[PDB]
Amino acid sequence: AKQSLDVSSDRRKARKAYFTAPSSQRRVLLSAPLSKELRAQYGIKALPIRRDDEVLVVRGSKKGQEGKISSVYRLKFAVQVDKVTKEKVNGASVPINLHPSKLVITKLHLDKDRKALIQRKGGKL
């Protein structure tokens, strides 16, 4: 279905670009359209992704668990969220990795550069 000669469907080249990604390919676009609480209510859709968003884990063993992103571990290809941690055997509590694609954003962390994309898109909220 791909058409242009500038796009490669090579699995080797694709995983090479994935693992050696700069911010142009450092995941998706890391900014990406949100979940249904914001999408379905308004229609004026999109806003970029940041750290201090709130999220709901919709998949996995920690499914249906809420929290704030403690850190966006770009190197590890995961996001860390507080209150979802592993209790170690010695009582220490280490943060458990979790992939954003298995998440929905429930509450954003807004700033000017987000509201610029609203003007750029044409949103009204």
């Binding site: 279905a1 090579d10 699995r11 080797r12």
Partner: protein
């Protein structure tokens, strides 16, 4: 061309209780004194190395091509060969299935799937959808990760959105009557492709 020959290995000769195969010189590495250059040698050159001037394309007589094409079109209208190919035409009212040339001008993919269900050919779709499986072997990481069956071949006289409307339809192939590849008419040298003709494509055959 230089694989297995990028070394200055030399035979020790007889008298040293070892095979007369060439061995790397020098010392202090582990590679030193090891066999080289041989198809039996670890790190050596393979026997009769593969070459690019191997014959890749093979010429077929033009007339034989059109003979095999006509045989493949003729086998399209044979119901027994089309079932034997496994082309799910039990719900097709007749074969050769010929549709009015409105389908030649269909625009959206929704009405390409709608047309297939209407002419009864969508059972071939569910075949291709459910026949997707991982390819067994190392072809998976040569960009051949999945395999599936073939669907119907929609043949049209004019392109008025027919190719675009059917492009994302799995297994379905479209073709202009002018070309009519044998590679699609007899996939895997097996006769009896399920072809859906538009009316104008059908009459162009004469």
């Amino acid at each position: 061309e230089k694989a297995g020959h990028q070394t200055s290995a030399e035979s020790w000769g007889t008298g040293r209780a070892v095979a007369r195969i060439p061995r790397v010189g020098g010392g202090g590495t582990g590679r030193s004194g090891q066999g080289a250059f041989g198809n039996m040698c670890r790190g050596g050159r393979m026997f009769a190395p593969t070459k690019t001037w191997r014959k890749w394309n093979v010429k077929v007589n033009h007339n034989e091509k059109r003979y095999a094409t006509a045989s493949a079109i003729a086998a399209t209208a044979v119901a027994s060969l089309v079932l034997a190919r496994g082309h799910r035409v039990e719900k097709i009212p007749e074969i050769p299935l010929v549709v009015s040339t409105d389908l030649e001008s269909i625009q959206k993919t929704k009405e390409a799937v709608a047309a297939l269900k209407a002419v009864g050919a969508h059972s071939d779709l569910l075949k291709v959808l459910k026949s997707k499986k991982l390819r067994a072997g190392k072809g998976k990481y040569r960009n051949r990760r999945w395999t599936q069956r073939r669907g119907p071949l929609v043949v049209y006289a004019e392109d008025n959105g027919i190719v675009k409307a059917l492009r994302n339809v799995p297994g379905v192939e479209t073709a202009n009557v002018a070309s009519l590849n044998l590679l699609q008419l007899a996939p895997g040298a097996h006769l009896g492709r399920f072809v859906i003709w538009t009316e104008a494509a059908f009459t162009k055959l004469d």
